[PDB]
Coordinates of C-alpha atoms (C1' of nucleotides) and ligand atoms in Angstrom, one line a residue:
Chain A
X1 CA 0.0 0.0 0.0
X2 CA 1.3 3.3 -1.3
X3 CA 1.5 5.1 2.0
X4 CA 3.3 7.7 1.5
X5 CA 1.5 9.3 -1.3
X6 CA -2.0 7.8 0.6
X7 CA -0.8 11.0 3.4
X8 CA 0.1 13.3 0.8
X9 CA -3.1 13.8 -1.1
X10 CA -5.3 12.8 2.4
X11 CA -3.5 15.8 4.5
X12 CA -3.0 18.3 1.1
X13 CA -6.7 18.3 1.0
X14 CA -6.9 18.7 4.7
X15 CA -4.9 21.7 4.5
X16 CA -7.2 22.5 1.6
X17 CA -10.0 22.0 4.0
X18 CA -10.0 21.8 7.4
X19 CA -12.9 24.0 9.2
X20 CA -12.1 26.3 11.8
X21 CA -14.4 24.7 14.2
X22 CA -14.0 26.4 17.9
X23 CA -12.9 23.4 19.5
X24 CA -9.7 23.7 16.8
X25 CA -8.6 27.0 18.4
X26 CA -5.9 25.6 20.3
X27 CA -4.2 21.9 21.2
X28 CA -5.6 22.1 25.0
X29 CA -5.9 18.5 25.7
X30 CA -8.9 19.5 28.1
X31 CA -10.6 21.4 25.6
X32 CA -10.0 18.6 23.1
X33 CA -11.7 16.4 25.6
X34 CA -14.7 18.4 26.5
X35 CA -15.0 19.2 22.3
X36 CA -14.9 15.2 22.0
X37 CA -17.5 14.0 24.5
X38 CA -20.0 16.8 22.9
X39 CA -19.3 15.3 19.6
X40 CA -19.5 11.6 20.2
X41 CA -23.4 12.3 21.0
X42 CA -24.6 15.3 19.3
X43 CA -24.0 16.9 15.3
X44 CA -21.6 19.6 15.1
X45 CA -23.6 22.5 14.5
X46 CA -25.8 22.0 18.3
X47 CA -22.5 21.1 19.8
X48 CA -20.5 25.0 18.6
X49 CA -22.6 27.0 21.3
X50 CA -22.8 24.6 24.4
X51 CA -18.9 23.9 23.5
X52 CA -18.3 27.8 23.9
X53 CA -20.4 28.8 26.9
X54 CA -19.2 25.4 28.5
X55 CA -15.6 27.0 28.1
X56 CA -16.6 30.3 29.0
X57 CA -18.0 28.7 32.0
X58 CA -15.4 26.4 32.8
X59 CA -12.1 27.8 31.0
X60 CA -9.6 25.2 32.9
X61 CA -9.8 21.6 33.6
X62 CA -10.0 22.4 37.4
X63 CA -12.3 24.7 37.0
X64 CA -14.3 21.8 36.6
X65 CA -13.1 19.4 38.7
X66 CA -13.9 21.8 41.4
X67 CA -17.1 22.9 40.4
X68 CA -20.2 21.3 42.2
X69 CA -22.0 18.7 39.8
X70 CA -24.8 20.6 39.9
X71 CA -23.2 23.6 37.9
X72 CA -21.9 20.9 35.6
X73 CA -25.4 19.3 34.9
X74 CA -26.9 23.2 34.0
X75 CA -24.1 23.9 31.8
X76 CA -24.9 20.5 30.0
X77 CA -28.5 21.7 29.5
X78 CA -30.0 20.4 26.0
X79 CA -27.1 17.9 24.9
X80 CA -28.3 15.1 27.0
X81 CA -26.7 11.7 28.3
X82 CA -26.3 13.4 31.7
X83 CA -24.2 10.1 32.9
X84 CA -21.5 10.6 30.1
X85 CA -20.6 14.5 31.7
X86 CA -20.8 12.8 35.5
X87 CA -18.3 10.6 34.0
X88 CA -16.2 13.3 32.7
X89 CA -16.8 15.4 36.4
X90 CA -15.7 12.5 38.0
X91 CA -12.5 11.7 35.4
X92 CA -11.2 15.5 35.7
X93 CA -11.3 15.4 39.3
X94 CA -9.1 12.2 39.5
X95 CA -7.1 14.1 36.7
X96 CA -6.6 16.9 39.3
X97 CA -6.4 15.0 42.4
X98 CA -4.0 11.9 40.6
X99 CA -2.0 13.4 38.1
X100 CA -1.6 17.4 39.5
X101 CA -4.7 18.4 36.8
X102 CA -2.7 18.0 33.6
X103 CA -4.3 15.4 31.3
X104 CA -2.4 11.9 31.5
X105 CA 0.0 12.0 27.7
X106 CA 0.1 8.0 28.6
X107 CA -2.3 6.2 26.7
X108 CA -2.9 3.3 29.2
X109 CA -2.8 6.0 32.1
X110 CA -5.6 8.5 30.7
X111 CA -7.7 5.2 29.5
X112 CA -8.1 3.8 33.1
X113 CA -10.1 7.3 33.4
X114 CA -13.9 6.6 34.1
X115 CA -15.5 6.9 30.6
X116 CA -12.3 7.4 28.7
X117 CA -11.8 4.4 26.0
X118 CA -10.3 4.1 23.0
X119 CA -11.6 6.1 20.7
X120 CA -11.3 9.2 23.7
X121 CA -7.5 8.0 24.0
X122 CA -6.2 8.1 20.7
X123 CA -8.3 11.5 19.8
X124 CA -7.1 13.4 22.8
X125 CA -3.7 12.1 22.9
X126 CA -2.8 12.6 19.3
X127 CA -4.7 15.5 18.4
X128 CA -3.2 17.5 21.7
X129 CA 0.3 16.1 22.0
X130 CA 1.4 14.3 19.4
X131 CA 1.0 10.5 20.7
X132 CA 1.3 8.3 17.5
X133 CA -2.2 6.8 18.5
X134 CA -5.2 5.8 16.3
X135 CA -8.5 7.7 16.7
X136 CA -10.8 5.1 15.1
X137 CA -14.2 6.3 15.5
X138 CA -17.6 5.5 13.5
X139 CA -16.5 8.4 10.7
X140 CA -12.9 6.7 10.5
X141 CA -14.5 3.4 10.7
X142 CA -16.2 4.3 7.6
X143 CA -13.4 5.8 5.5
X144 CA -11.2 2.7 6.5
X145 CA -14.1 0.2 5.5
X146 CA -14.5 1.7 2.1
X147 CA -10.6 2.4 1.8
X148 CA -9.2 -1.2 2.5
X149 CA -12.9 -2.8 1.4
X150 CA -13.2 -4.2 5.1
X151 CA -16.6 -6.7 5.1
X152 CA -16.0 -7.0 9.1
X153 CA -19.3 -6.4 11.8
X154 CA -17.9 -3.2 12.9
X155 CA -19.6 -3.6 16.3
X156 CA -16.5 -6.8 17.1
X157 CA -13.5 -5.9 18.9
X158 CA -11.7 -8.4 16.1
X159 CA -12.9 -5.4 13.3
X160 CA -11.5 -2.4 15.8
X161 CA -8.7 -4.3 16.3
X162 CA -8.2 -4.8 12.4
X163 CA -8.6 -0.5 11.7
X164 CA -6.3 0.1 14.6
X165 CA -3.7 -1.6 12.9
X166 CA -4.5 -0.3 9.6
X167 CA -3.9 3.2 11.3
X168 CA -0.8 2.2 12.7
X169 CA 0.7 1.0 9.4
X170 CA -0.7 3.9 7.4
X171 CA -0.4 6.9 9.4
X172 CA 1.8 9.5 9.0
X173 CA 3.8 9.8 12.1
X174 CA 5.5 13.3 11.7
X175 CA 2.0 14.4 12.7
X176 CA -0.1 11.7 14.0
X177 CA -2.5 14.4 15.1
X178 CA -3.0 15.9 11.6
X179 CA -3.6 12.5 10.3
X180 CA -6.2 11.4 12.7
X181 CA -8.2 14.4 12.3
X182 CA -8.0 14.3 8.3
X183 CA -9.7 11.0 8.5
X184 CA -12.1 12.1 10.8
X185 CA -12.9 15.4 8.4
X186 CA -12.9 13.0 5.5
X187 CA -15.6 10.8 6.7
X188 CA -17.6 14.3 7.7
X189 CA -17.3 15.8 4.8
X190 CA -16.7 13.2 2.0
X191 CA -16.8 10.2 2.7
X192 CA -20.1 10.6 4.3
X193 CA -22.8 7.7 5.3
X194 CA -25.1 7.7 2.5
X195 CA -24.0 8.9 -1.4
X196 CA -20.5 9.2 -0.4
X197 CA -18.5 12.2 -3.0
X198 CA -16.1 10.0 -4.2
X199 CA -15.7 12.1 -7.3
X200 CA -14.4 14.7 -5.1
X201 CA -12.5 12.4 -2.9
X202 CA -8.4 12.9 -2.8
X203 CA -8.2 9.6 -2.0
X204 CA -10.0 8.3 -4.6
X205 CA -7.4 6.1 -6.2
X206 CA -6.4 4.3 -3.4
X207 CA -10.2 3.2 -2.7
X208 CA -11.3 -0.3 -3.2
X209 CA -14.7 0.1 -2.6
X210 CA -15.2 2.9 -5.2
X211 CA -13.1 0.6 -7.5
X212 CA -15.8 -1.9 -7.0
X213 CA -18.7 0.0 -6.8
X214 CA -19.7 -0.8 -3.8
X215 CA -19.0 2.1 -1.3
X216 CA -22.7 2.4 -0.3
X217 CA -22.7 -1.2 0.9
X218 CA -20.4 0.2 3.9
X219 CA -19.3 -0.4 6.5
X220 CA -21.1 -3.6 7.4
X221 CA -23.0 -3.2 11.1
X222 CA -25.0 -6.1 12.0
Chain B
dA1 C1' -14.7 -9.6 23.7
dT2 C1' -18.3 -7.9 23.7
dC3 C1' -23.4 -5.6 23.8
dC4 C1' -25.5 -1.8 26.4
dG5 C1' -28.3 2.6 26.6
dG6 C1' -30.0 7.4 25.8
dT7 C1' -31.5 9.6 22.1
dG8 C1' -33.8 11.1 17.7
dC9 C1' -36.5 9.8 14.2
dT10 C1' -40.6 7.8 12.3
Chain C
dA1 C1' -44.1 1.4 18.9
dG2 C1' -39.5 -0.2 16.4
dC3 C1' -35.1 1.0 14.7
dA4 C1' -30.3 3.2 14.0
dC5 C1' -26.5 5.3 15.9
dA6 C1' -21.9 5.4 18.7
dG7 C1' -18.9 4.8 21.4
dG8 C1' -17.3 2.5 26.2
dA9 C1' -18.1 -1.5 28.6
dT10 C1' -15.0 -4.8 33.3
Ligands
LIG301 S1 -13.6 7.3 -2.8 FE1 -15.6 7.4 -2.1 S2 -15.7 5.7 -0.7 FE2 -13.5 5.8 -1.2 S3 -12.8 7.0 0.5 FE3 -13.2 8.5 -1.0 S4 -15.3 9.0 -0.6 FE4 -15.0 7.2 0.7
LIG302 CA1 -10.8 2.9 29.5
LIG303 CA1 -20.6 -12.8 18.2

DNA sequence: ATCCGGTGCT
DNA sequence: AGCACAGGAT
């Protein structure tokens, strides 16, 4: 597999590309965090303002460890799943209290975080300090399934297993973080669930499933 | 190595 | 009412 020239084109069009989404402002591994839990739940455009006044509100990551749960719970207003943000109150606290408030850069170490897994660990990690990690999420999922023509059940640990390695032999490590995002972007903007623009794709040519006509038909979920 | 759940949509 | 989504789940 060309990977080399795979980066080239994928992170060219990235530079092309990439939206100036708040959360992208700066590499603050807390604000990276917060931006991530949003996402994982609600579509971009509800998540901009409750991302922003969340901020506003809480503008460090102990500023919310110490804040009472109750504050926490009114500034999560309207997104929902009020057990994931408990989970994040109670993993910044033990960030604060455990590792002096700075965001574990250890991937094993920030994962034993309540409601931090995989997915959490490689987007954090990579996307604020560089860790070589993948970020496989449903988006990258996606891309990857269509990329490499992947017929897996994407719900298995086997098929996750599978992309993370994919990730790990494809990525471009002089900027892990720019690569994990560019995927990511891809699969928002391009590579999208249904009717995928694979005429506008820069990755076209390195695409089995568009060489076989079949990018609709993925990935498989069962 | 999952399979669960809160949510939105219909 | 049933269904799809999306990650963490121990
Ligand atoms: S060519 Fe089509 S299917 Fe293949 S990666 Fe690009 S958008 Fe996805
Ligand atoms: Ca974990
Ligand atoms: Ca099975």
């Amino acid at each position: 597999f060309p990977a080399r020239e795979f980066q080239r084109d994928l992170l060219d069009w990235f530079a092309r590309e990439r939206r100036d989404l708040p959360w992208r402002k700066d590499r603050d591994p807390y604000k990276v965090w917060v931006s991530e839990v949003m996402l994982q739940q609600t579509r971009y455009e509800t998540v901009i303002p409750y991302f922003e006044q969340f901020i506003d509100r809480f503008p460090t990551l102990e500023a919310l460890a110490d804040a009472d749960e109750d504050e926490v719970l009114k500034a999560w207003e309207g997104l929902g799943y009020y057990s994931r943000v408990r989970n994040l109150h109670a993993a910044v606290k033990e960030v604060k209290t455990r590792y002096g408030g700075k965001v574990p850069d250890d991937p094993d170490e920030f994962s034993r975080l309540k409601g931090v897994g995989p997915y959490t660990v490689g987007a954090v990690l990579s996307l604020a300090y560089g860790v070589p990690e993948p970020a496989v999420n449903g988006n990258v999922m996606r891309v990857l399934s269509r990329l490499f023509l992947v017929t897996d059940d994407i719900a298995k640990c086997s098929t996750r297993k599978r992309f993370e390695q994919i990730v790990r032999e494809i990525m471009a490590y002089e900027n892990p973080g720019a690569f994990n995002e560019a995927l990511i972007e891809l699969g928002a903007l391009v590579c999208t669930p249904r009717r995928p623009s694979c005429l506008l794709c820069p990755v076209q040519a390195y695409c089995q499933a568009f060489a076989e006509g079949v990018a609709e038909e993925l990935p498989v979920k069962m």
